[PDB]
Amino acid sequence: MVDTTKNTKLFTSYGVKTSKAITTEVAAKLISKAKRPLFVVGTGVLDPELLDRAVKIAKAKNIPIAATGSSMPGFVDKDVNAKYINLHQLGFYLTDPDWPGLDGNGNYDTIILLGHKKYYINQVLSAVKNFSDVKSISIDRNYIQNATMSFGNLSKADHIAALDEVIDLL
Amino acid sequence: MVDTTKNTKLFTSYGVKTSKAITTEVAAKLISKAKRPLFVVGTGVLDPELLDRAVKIAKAKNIPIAATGSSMPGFVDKDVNAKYINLHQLGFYLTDPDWPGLDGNGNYDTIILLGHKKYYINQVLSAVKNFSDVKSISIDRNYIQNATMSFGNLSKADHIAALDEVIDLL
Amino acid sequence: LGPMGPTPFPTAATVRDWSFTLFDRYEPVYTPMCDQCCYCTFGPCNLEGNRRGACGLDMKGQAAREFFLRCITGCACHSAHGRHLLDHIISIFGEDMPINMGASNVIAPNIQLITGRQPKTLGDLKPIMEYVEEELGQLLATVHAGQEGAAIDYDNKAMLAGILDHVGMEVSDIAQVTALGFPKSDPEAPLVEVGMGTLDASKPVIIAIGHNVAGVTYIMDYMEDNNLTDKMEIGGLCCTAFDMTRYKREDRKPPYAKIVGTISKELKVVRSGIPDVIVIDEQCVRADLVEEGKKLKIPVIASNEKVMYGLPDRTNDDVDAIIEDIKTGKIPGCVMLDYEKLGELVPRLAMEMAPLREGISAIPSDEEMASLVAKCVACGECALACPEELDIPDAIQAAKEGDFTALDFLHDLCVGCRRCEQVCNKEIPILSVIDKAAQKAIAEEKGLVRAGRGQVSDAEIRAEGLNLVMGTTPGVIAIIGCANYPAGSKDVYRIAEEFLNRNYIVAVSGCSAMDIGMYKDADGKTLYERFPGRFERGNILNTGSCVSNSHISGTCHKVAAIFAGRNLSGNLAEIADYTLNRVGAVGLAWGAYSQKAAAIGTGCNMYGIPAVLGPHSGKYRRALIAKTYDENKWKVYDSRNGSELDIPPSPEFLITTAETWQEACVLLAKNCIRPSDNNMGRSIKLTHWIELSEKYLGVLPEDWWKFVRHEADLPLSRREELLKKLETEHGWEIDWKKKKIISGPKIKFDVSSQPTNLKRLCK
Amino acid sequence: LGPMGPTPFPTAATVRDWSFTLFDRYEPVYTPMCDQCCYCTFGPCNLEGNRRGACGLDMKGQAAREFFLRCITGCACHSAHGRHLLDHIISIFGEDMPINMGASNVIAPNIQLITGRQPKTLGDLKPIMEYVEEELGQLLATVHAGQEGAAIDYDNKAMLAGILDHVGMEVSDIAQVTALGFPKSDPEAPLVEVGMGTLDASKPVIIAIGHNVAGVTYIMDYMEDNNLTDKMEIGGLCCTAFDMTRYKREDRKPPYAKIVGTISKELKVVRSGIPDVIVIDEQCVRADLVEEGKKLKIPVIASNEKVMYGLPDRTNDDVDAIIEDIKTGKIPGCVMLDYEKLGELVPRLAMEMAPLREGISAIPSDEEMASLVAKCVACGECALACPEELDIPDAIQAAKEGDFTALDFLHDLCVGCRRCEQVCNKEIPILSVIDKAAQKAIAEEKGLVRAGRGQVSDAEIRAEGLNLVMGTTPGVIAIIGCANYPAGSKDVYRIAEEFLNRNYIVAVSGCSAMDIGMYKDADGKTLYERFPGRFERGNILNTGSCVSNSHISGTCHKVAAIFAGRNLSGNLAEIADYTLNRVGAVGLAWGAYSQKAAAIGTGCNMYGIPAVLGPHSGKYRRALIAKTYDENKWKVYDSRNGSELDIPPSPEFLITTAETWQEACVLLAKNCIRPSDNNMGRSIKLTHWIELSEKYLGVLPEDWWKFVRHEADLPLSRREELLKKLETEHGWEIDWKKKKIISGPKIKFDVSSQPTNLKRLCK
Numbered sequence A, B: 001m002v003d004t005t006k007n008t009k010l011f012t013s014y015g016v017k018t019s020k021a022i023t024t025e026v027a028a029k030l031i032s033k034a035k036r037p038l039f040v041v042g043t044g045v046l047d048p049e050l051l052d053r054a055v056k057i058a059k060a061k062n063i064p065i066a067a068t069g070s071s072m073p074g075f076v077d078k079d080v081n082a083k084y085i086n087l088h089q090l091g092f093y094l095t096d097p098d099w100p101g102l103d104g105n106g107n108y109d110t111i112i113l114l115g116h117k118k119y120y121i122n123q124v125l126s127a128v129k130n131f132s133d134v135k136s137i138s139i140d141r142n143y144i145q146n147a148t149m150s151f152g153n154l155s156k157a158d159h160i161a162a163l164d165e166v167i168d169l170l
Numbered sequence C, D: 001l002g003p004m005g006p007t008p009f010p011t012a013a014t015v016r017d018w019s020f021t022l023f024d025r026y027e028p029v030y031t032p033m034c035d036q037c038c039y040c041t042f043g044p045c046n047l048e049g050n051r052r053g054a055c056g057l058d059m060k061g062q063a064a065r066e067f068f069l070r071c072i073t074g075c076a077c078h079s080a081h082g083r084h085l086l087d088h089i090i091s092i093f094g095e096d097m098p099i100n101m102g103a104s105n106v107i108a109p110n111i112q113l114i115t116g117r118q119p120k121t122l123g124d125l126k127p128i129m130e131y132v133e134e135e136l137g138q139l140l141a142t143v144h145a146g147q148e149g150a151a152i153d154y155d156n157k158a159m160l161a162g163i164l165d166h167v168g169m170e171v172s173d174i175a176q177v178t179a180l181g182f183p184k185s186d187p188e189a190p191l192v193e194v195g196m197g198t199l200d201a202s203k204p205v206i207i208a209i210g211h212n213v214a215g216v217t218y219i220m221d222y223m224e225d226n227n228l229t230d231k232m233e234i235g236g237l238c239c240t241a242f243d244m245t246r247y248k249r250e251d252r253k254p255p256y257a258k259i260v261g262t263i264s265k266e267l268k269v270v271r272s273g274i275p276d277v278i279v280i281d282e283q284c285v286r287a288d289l290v291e292e293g294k295k296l297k298i299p300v301i302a303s304n305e306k307v308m309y310g311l312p313d314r315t316n317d318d319v320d321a322i323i324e325d326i327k328t329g330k331i332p333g334c335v336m337l338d339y340e341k342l343g344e345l346v347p348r349l350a351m352e353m354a355p356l357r358e359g360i361s362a363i364p365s366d367e368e369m370a371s372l373v374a375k376c377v378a379c380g381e382c383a384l385a386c387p388e389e390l391d392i393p394d395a396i397q398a399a400k401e402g403d404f405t406a407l408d409f410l411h412d413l414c415v416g417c418r419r420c421e422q423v424c425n426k427e428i429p430i431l432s433v434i435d436k437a438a439q440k441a442i443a444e445e446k447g448l449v450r451a452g453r454g455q456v457s458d459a460e461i462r463a464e465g466l467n468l469v470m471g472t473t474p475g476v477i478a479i480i481g482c483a484n485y486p487a488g489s490k491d492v493y494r495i496a497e498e499f500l501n502r503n504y505i506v507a508v509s510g511c512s513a514m515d516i517g518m519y520k521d522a523d524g525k526t527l528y529e530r531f532p533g534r535f536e537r538g539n540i541l542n543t544g545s546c547v548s549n550s551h552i553s554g555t556c557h558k559v560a561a562i563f564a565g566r567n568l569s570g571n572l573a574e575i576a577d578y579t580l581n582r583v584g585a586v587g588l589a590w591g592a593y594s595q596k597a598a599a600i601g602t603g604c605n606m607y608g609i610p611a612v613l614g615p616h617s618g619k620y621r622r623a624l625i626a627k628t629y630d631e632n633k634w635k636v637y638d639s640r641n642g643s644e645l646d647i648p649p650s651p652e653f654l655i656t657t658a659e660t661w662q663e664a665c666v667l668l669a670k671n672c673i674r675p676s677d678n679n680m681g682r683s684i685k686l687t688h689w690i691e692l693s694e695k696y697l698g699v700l701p702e703d704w705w706k707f708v709r710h711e712a713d714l715p716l717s718r719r720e721e722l723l724k725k726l727e728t729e730h731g732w733e734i735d736w737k738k739k740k741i742i743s744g745p746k747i748k749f750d751v752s753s754q755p756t757n758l759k760r761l762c763k
Ligand code: SF4
Pocket: C037, C038, C039, C040, C041, C042, C043, C044, C045, C052, C053, C054, C055, C056, C057, C145, C146
C-alpha cells in the first residue's frame, strides 16, 4: 500500500550488505534533497502508465534524464532534458570523478532508478556502489539489493500508487 | 540480558536463508518441547561457568550429551549421559535416518549447540540443514546463520545471563 | 622457413605489451557478481568497498580472477574437444592426411598467427595441441591462492587464454572438416530443417545432445548401412546438431538428420515425450535428463568420459544384454565408450523402445490443466526464481478465466530451466503448463537453416575488398554465441534482418543461427532462403558450430595478409593493430552464458574485434570500455614518420553489453567506423548509423560530428541539412557556393595516413 | 619391458571402478560453502535444500564440482612448477643426466605406479609431464557448465586429479634433487636456523618469498662468488626457504640461508622493516606486498611470469639503471625474468638500499601504542572479521589499563592477515599493536629444523619392516600441510612430541616442519636435535617442501613392492588396496588452506592413506567418512579362496576434520589399526590408542572390543582387567585358568588371511 517495505525477499544474495527498504516519504525527501540527481531510466518506463509518472517526477525537480537502452523515443515530445547513454557506459563513467557529465558540469552524487531489469541494474550497481561514492534510490517494483535505498517488492498497481504518492509529496 | 536478538551482524553470508534470532523464552520452549533432543557440545564449554550451566541444562530436561572434540573430561564426574563423537562424523550420521544413535534408540529431531567455533559448526550445519530435517537451536554467543534458531551476538556476561534465564524457564 | 614475427608461441610475458596498450584505451570495468571470495579456507573473505582479503587480493583482483577462470575454462573445453577429436581422427584415418579446407593461401590463420607454424598434415596439428595444453596448465596454476595479485595481469592472462581458445577451436574445425567430409568453403551449403515440429512421432526418435560428432558419426553410419534412414528420425540439440548435419555433405545434398533446437529446448523436448532414446556426449547437456527420463521411460546413453552421469559402465558387455536390461527397466542408461558398439546399440535401442513408450508425456490434458491453473494462489515465488523475469503469476491468473494467451506469449521467452517449479509449494509444473498452452505454436515450429560452410575462401574476401573500399559494404556483423536471450529468440533474427536489409555482411554460428532460421516472413521464407549464403554484401553465411568461430576472426586475419601483405607468422600485435585500425567488423553474442562465449569474446578482443553481448553477460564480471570524453585516450602514431595522429572515438568499446535489440542495432552500426576509411566507406557507415539511431532511439546522435573530416563524409541524401546543422550549432566554416567544408574538423582527411598503436612499427 | 598392470596412464573411466569401490565404504560428505552457484550467466542459482539450478545440477553436484576445481587447481600448480623447473634444469645441465635420488630399487614409485614408465634420465621425465598436462586439460574441461551432472563422477575425477598431482610433485622433486645437489636420502641432514629472531638487522637482509628456487639459486651463486655471505643475510619464507636450505647441501655442511617462517609471518616480517629487498617467485605470496613496501621503502622484485604483480617489465634494461630508478623512488619494484641479471640485481639492490632505509618500520612506539590503545571504543568489528576468532576487543581493553599480556597471547594465534584493520573505523593497526606487544617473544623467536632429506631409501624401510611386524613401531604419522592453524603454531609440535615419545614414525614437510622446529624444551633443544632423523621408531625426518610429500606417499608404495613383491607398473588399484588393508600410516594437515593441500589429501586418499585435517578444512566442501554402525559396509574378499571376510572398522575415514589437537591425537592413534596386523602390532596399537583416549578424552573407548580378536591382542599392562570388562559387560567366554579367550569375538584371528577389496585378485 504505502508500506513499500513489507516485502524485501530475494532469490540470491550478493552479500551481507543490502540496500535499505524505504517508504514513499523517505524516498521523496531523498530525491528532493539531493544536490545533483540524475534520473536513470530503462526500457521498462515505456509503459504508458509509468512514462507520464516519470515525466512528472522529472518536471517537478528539473532532474536530467539518462534514457538507457531504447527508452529515448518516449521523451522526444515531453519538455524534459533527456539524453541517451549506454547503461554499462554510464556505470563506468559514474566511477570517474573527472567525467564532465551529460551536460559538462561535472559528476553526480545521487541517481534514481526506474524501469530496469533486476539482473542488469544490479550488475551495474555492483560496480557503482563498490568503486565510487554515488548513492542510488530505486523507485522500481523490485527490491534492488545493490542500490543504497530501494522500494520493496510491489505489484503493478501498488507500484503506481506508491509513485503517485511520491509525486504528490515531491 | 533478556534481549538476544538486537545483534545479528555477520561478516560473510551463506545465502538468502538465515536462522531466526530467538529470545530466551522461545529457546526454553523449543528445548522443552522437543521429542528427542541431543545436546551437541564443543570444547568451548570447558569454561567453568559454561560447564556448570550446560550441566544444569542437561540435568533439567534429561538430554543426552554428545561431547565433540576434547570436551569429554568435563563430564566424567558430573552425573550425566555424555558420549564422545567427532562433529564431522556426527553431522554425517545425523543425515541418515537409519542411524541407531548414541544409545541405539534411533535418530534425533532437534539438536542444541553450545560452545563451538562459528566457522566449524556453520560448516557442519551446512550439510545438516541441507541434507536432512533435523532442527538446530544455537544457545551460543555467536549468531549461527546455518542453524534453524539461534541467539544473537552477545558478550560473555550477556551470554551467561541469557543461559541463566533459559535455565530458570526450563 | 619464412619471416617470423616477434611473438611466436606467446606466453603471459610475451603478450603483456600489447595487452597493456589495449587496456590503456579500453579500460577494464569490473562488475562483481559477489561480495565474497571463497577460494581457500582462510575465507570466505568479504571484499565489499574494494577491501582486501586475508591474502591481500582486493575486490577488483577477485573479479578479474573470476573472469580469467571463466576464460580458461572455456579455452579448456574447446582444446579438450580438439584433442579428443584429433586423436580419434588420426587413429581412424592416419596422421599423414593433407589438410583440405577450400581455396585459400593461408589454411589456418589463427595457428599461423599464434604459433607461426604452417601445418600441412593432420599429424602436424599434434605439437600445436601440446603447446595449447602446456600453456593452459600454467594459466590454471594462476587460479591458486597467492598467485598474481594485480588485476591488470589477470586481464592480460585472460586475453592470452582467449587467443589460445581460438587456436584450439581452429584445430578442432580443421581436423573435423578435413576428415569427416564437411563442406569446404562452400557458398551453396544445403538447407536443413529445424524446429520442434520437424520430428515425427510416428517413427522412433533419437536425440543427440553434445558438441562432438565422433559417436553419432558411427550411429549415422549404422543407420545408413542398415537402411533405416526412412524408418527412423535422428535429431540433434546444440552444436552436435550442426556437426552431424555437416557430416558427409561435400556433395551439396540435403541431409536426413534434423536440428531440434538450442539448450533452452532440451528439457522441453524431454517433456514432450517425442524422443525415444537420448544419447548425450559433452558440453551443454542438462544434468537432470535422467531424472525425467525415469518418469517418461526415455533411456539416456552416455558416450564420453567427461559426462558419464553416474550411470553403470557397460562398455564391455553385450549389446543385447544392455538392450534387455534397459527394456526391462533395470537401469535408465549406461556409459557406452566403445563407439562401434554404441553406433549399433543406440538405433537398436530406439527401435526396441519406441512401441513400449507411445503416448506417454508430461504435458497435461485439458482437465489436468484446469486443475493445475485453479490450484495457484499467486504467491509470487516463481516470478522471483525466474532467470528471465517472467510474469508467471499474472499469466496464471489470466489463464484462470480461460485466457491462455499469456502463457503462449511466455513460452517463447522461457528457456526451459524448471527453476520455478522448485519454489512452488502447490507443486505446479509451470513449464509443462506453458508448453501445453503453446502446443499450437509448437506444432508449427519449423524453419530452414543453411549448413555450416566452413571457412571463408580467399576469392570471396578479395571480391569483397573492393565493395568495402568503394563504400558499398558498410561493414561486417558476426552473430554468434549461446541462447540465453532476455526477450526470446526473435531479437537476434530482427537484428540480422535489419542489418541484411542494409547490405551488411552477416556471418552467423552456433545456436544463434538455429534461432535465426526459425522465423519466416509473409511469403513463408526464412532469411537463409531470402538472402544468399556466400561472403558478400547483403548475404548471410553460416560457419557451423561455435568451433567454427575461429573462421570468423580468422577471416579478419586474412584481410591483413591479403591486402596489406602483412606477415602472419607470430605477429599477433601487428595483425591485431591492423584489424583494430582498419577493419570494420563487430561481433554480437545476444545470449552468451557459457564460458566458451567468454573465451571467444576475449579472443576476439585480443584480435581487435569489438563485441556486444546480451544484458545477462553483465554477470561475466568484466567489460572493456573507453573514455570518449578523454581526448588524450584517442592518440596513435603515424607509420610514415612516427608523428602523433588523432583518431575518432571508434570503436568506443572492446566488449560491452546492451539492454534491448534496438540499442544493440545502434551500437553495432556505430562501432563499424574505423579511422582508416576513405570518404565512401565513412559516408555509408555514417548514413546507416544515423538512420538506425533516428529509427530506434528517435534522435540524431550527439557525437556524429566527431566522425566528419570531409564534406564527402556525410550521407548523400542529407548532406546540405547536415552542413547547416554543423554551421549553425558548432561554428564550422562551410563554402556554401561549392558545398565544401572550409574549416572546423579537428581531424583532417588523409587517406595515405597509416595509424598504428605500436611505435616500433614506425620509421 | 616388465609386467604391466591393468591401468597404465589412467583416465576418468580407467580409475572409476577403484574410486567407486572406495566410495562404497567411505561415502562422501558434502559441506557446501554457499547456497548459490555463480558460474554461468543463467545464475546465480539458489540450490538450498538440495535444489537444482537452471542446468539441472543440484547442491551436492555443485559442492563436488567446487572440491574438484580446488583439486585440479592444486594439481596444476605443482605440475606447472614441475614443468618450469624441469625445463630450466634440462636447459642448464642437459637432458641426459641420470636421475640421482639415493639408494632404492624403485626410483620414482609414483611415476612407475601411475604411468608404468621407469625413467633413467632427465629427458625421460618430459613425456610424463606431457601426459600430466594433457589429462589435466581434460579435467579442467569438466568445470564448464553442462558437463558431468552426477556428484560421484566429480569425486572420481577429483581422485584422478589427486594422483596426477602426486605424479607432478614427484617429477618436480626428482628433477630438482638430481640437478641442484640436494641431499640424497641423507638421515643426517644439516640443521638450519629458523625464526624471526635469526635475521640480523646490521647487515642488508634479502627476503625470498614463493616456491620456485631457479632464481634464488642464481642469487646465492652470485653471493658466494662475490664473497658476500658474511656481509649479507639471506632468508626465505614458505617452501622456497627449504629449497635454498637444501641447495648444494649433500656435503652435510651447514648453510648460510635462513628460514624466516610460514605465510602467516610474511606481512609481519614486512611490518618489521628488517627486509631491505623482497624477491617473489610464485605460489603462496600475499598480494598486498608493494602496498606496504612503498610505505616502508622496501623494493619488490618479481621473477616469474605467473606473478608479475602489475610491475614494470625491466627484463631488457641495464641493472644499474634499474638500481638508480628504485633508489630514487620512481618505481617500487620490477619484473626481472632474466635469471642471470636478477641474481646480480637483487644483492646489489640490497647493498645499495640498506643504508637509505635503516630504522623505518610500522611498529609503533610506546606513546603511539598508548594513544592507539586509548583510541578504541570496543565496537566488536575486528573480532567479527578475524578468521581465527580472536578476542581483540577484550585484549585491547586489557591493554588500556597496561596489561599487554593479552595481545602477547594473541600474537601466536594471529595469522597476520590484517583483515581486522579494514573494519576498524578508528583506523587502528591492530596487527602492528599485537606485534609491538609481542616484541620480546619475536626477539627470542629462534629454533632449529633439519633440512630436507629427500626420499626414504630401501634399506631404512627394510630395517623398519621387522619393527612394524614385531609390534615395536605402532605406525607412521605424517605431519604436512599449510599453516592456517586454529590455535597457533604449537599444536603440530604437541602432536609430534606426543607421537615421538610413543615410538611412532613421524615424517614432516612444508610449513608444518618450520612450525614444529620453532619450540624447545627446558634444555633448550628442538625435536630435531632431540630425536634422530632416520626412518625408524622414535625418529622425526623432514622430506622438504610440499613437492617432497610425494616421497611420503611414495614410501608407502615401496612397502607394497619390496615386501610383498607386488608389481608397481600401472597397478594403482592393487597397490592402493594393499596399502589400505595392511599399512598403518595416517597423514595430518592441521592448517591446510590452499588447493595444493586439498590435492595432496585427495591423492593420498586414492592411494589408501587416511588423513586428518584441521577444522578450517571443513571449508573444503568434502570429506570421506564411513558408516561404522553399518555392519555390511565392512566386508572384503579373501584372496586365498574368494570367500567373504570381515574386517574391523579401521580406518573409519579417509578425510575428516578434527577440532582440537587432543582429538587429533586420539584419531591418529586409532586410525593406524589395520585388519592385517599380527598380535603384537594390534596389541601395541590398541595400547597406545587406549592410553591416549584415557589421557585426553578421560574415558576408555566405547568400541575397543571391536578390535579384540585374540587374548594376545590386549595391552600387556592392562590385560586381566580388560578381559574382565569383556566378560562382564559383553558376555564373552574367557578361560580364566589359562588367560585365554574361549569365545565371543566376531572376527577370528588368522594371520595367513589376505583381505582384499578387489574381486579379480581372488583365486
Ligand atoms: S583466496 Fe584470498 S580472498 Fe579468497 S578466501 Fe583465500 S584469503 Fe580470502
